[PDB]
Amino acid sequence: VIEKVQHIQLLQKNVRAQLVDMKRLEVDIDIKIRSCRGSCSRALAREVDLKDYEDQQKQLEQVIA
Amino acid sequence: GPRP
Amino acid sequence: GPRP
Amino acid sequence: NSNIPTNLRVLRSILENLRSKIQKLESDVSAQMEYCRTPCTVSCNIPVVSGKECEEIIRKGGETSEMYLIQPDSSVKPYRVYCDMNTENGGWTVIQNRQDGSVDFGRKWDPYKQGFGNVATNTDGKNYCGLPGEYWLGNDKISQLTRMGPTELLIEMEDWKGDKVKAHYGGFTVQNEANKYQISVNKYRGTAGNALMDGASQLMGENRTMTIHNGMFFSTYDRDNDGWLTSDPRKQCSKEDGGGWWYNRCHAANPNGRYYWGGQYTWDMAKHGTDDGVVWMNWKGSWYSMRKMSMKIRPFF
Amino acid sequence: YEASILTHDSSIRYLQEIYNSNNQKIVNLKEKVAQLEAQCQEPCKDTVQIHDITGKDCQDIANKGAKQSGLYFIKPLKANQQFLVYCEIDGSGNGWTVFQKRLDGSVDFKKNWIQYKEGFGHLSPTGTTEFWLGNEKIHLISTQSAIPYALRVELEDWNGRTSTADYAMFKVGPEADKYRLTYAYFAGGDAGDAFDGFDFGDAPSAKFFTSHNGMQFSTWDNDNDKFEGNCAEQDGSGWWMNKCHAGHLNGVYYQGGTYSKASTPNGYDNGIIWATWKTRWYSMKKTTMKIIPFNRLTI
Ligand SMILES: *[C@@H]1O[C@H](CO[C@@H]2O[C@@H](C)[C@@H](O)[C@@H](O)[C@@H]2O)[C@@H](O[C@@H]2O[C@H](CO)[C@@H](O)[C@H](O)[C@H]2NC(C)=O)[C@H](O)[C@H]1NC(C)=O
Ligand SMILES: [Ca+2]
Ligand SMILES: [Ca+2]
Fold first, then answer.
1. What is the C-alpha to C-alpha distance for residues D152 and E33, in angstroms, rounded to an integer?
2. How many beta carbons lie within 10 A of that of residue E53, not counting itself?
């Protein structure tokens, strides 16, 4: 627990939270955009890739060790 | 239609 | 889902 | 000691990836906002045959499944509904339908009271709407239909693999608004498991009991009539599990949940960690959002 | 390769600067996602809409202001509930209540008793769909106290020509009397009086056996014609059969107009005919049966 080590202890926690926070917004946006298909002229065709997020979340843990 |  |  | 380096890397690597992901999302959302400057449209010519409800209509000769106009009672003004005239002898008035996530189901008390979504869409080419859309008939209407006389309920679903199951209910009623649209069901049977009456199949005692829907009041994210005695405003069921439902504490079935593409989903995707999404625990568990989910009624003989 | 320790001080801050920046961009995106939501609450707009003006019939509605044709709800005097109908409103305050329409052979007119009783087909605001309003409704509209109606029939061949036929005091009886057709007299029309029967030059009684005034409605599953056989079944329609007909507006829709004996399953003429205007082997391209109060048809 040094000056720099503390700064990075938090940076891991923060990115682990943003990783989750994003992984969700990603899903929220997919469902929301789709739910406009029955209301708006059209719904942006798209496909969500969770792997990239999951691959990174396991990646973070690999260095938090 | 006149039937027989 | 419950809320035990 | 040389850990700080590989750490500042993996941290820099991800924060720049997320930066990109954000860029993609602001793109997608900005594009959708534009497409929404104009609406989607349909053209549904109205069938001549009409009646108090779908059962009367089929008995009157309307033998095809499409949008029909019905008038449960002289008081009410005639309104559109989708009639399933093929499943189990037809005559089924559709009150709830899920199939493509095209409609938003996380709405307030009033939209759920009045009804929302698309009753029907055009049958590719035709002038009538022989295809059903995603919708919630409306609590006032559903309550009035069930109170006309004995009514049975037919809930249907399909997983993203094509497997189908159903939960039947020989008796189904929903009280009016003044009674918080209280729900009552009985005389169950089917291949999906009685989740509305018994509760979460894979649960024990108190845990399974707090997931029983029968007898519950209707709740929306802006109207808490759930069986969850909390003090924290964020702890209401509707706010957590998505849309409006006869939430107890909280559910074993969530027909009006969020539509997850693919079926499989997990707590890390859920907006609140809760198990939102078109759920019917007794059949596929708590983390599976069906591809098809519908609720229909008919007079009981 | 391996940055010097002095770099650590700078790197720690860089991450924090973008981490926090990423964070802000999110707080903002969610905001936009919330604004998107308010934009996705409405259903697709339905082109077909029903006007608010209602009355005892289409003429009544038009007398109440209604100016354009389209779907309306009417409710004759003795009717339990209101029902939708199509109203043709001209520029003279005349409200016609159409009850039969043919124009593409999209709707199959081989229906049973109940179907012909409750009606079938589709109503369109643009008046471009085929249908049968339903015998009961037709009965209710034409038998309101003291209001004497008139029927106008409109045909159109495939060459572009059109013709009409009017009938005073048009009336359709109740189901107990098999929805019998009756009219005071032919009111005139270039289409020619077909309900009066036609001399197919085959019998001594010429006209008689193919006249319609007074005939009861007939369907394959409910025979009430003046023939030992079943007109409705053989001609595959629902109509006021005699033995059998001179006018067959609910007959089989023959594409082109000129059909033949070979075309028919049994052998008899089953097309949309009207002998006083076209050979029994010529099926009309369009057809419309509409009614209005008689005092309205230019006195
Ligand atoms: C009722 O549920 C609670 C909440 O736990 C959840 O439900 C369980 C049935 C099981 O599926 C868990 O994995 C879920 O997380 C149970 O909580 C118990 O809590 C005590 C501490 O108070 C703990 O020691 C137990 O291990 C928990 N239950 C177990 C054995 O997992 C509770 O036990 C459940 N009781 C009933 C009625 O089954
Ligand atoms: Ca509560
Ligand atoms: Ca006969």
1. 39
2. 16
In CATH, what number is assigned to the domain containing residue E154?
3.90.215.10
Q: Which atom of ligand 1 is nearest to the CA of D206?
A: 37
Distance from Cα D237 to the centre of ligand 2, integer Å = 8
User: Does E179 lie in the same domain as E72?
Assistant: yes
Identify whether the C-beta of residue D49 lies closer than 8 Å to the C-beta of residue E118.
Answer: yes
Nearest to D48 among E22, E32, E119 (CB): E119
Architecture of domain D1-44: Up-down Bundle (1.20)
Structure method: X-ray
Show the tokens assigned to E85: 């109908």
Q: Are residues E84 and E155 in the same domain?
A: yes
Among D204, D207, D209, D275, residue to substitute to test ligand 1 (most atoms within 8 Å of Cβ): D207
Q: With an 8 Å Cβ cutoff, is E237 touching chain B?
A: no
Fold classified for D45-192+292-301: Gamma Fibrinogen; Chain A, domain 1 (3.90.215)
Please state, as a whole number, how many other Cβ atoms lie within 10 Å of the Cβ of residue D103. 26
Residues in chain E, total: 299
Is E156 exposed, middle or buried, given 0-12, 13-18 or 19+ CB atoms closer than 10 A? middle
Residue owning the nearest CA to atom 34 of ligand 1: D207
E42 interaction partners in chain D (CB closer than 8 Å): 39
Q: Which residues of E117-149 are buried (b: 16+ CB within 10 A; e: fewer)?
A: bbbbbbbbbebebbbbbbbbbbbbbbbbeebeb
Token pair recorded at residue E284: 């009309």
Would you identify the CATH topology of the domain A1-65? 1.20.5
For E42, the 3-state DSSP assignment is coil
Residue E253, domain extent: 192-285
E181 shares a domain with E34: no
How far apart are the C-alpha atoms of D49 and E90, rounded to whole Å? 26
Neighbouring residues of E234: CB distance < 8 A, sequence distance ≥ 6:
B3, E244, E266, E268, E270
Name subunits touching B (3+ CB pairs < 8 A).
E
Would you list the domain boundaries of chain A?
A: 1-65
Resolution in A: 2.7
Task: Report CA(D227)–ligand 2 centroid distance (Å).
Answer: 6
Q: Tell me, yes or no, whether E33 and E68 share the same domain.
A: no
Which atom of ligand 1 is the closest one to the Cα of D203?
Answer: 9
Q: Tokens for E168, please give them.
A: 């005073």
Query: How far apart are alpha carbons E215 and E223 in whole angstroms?
Result: 11
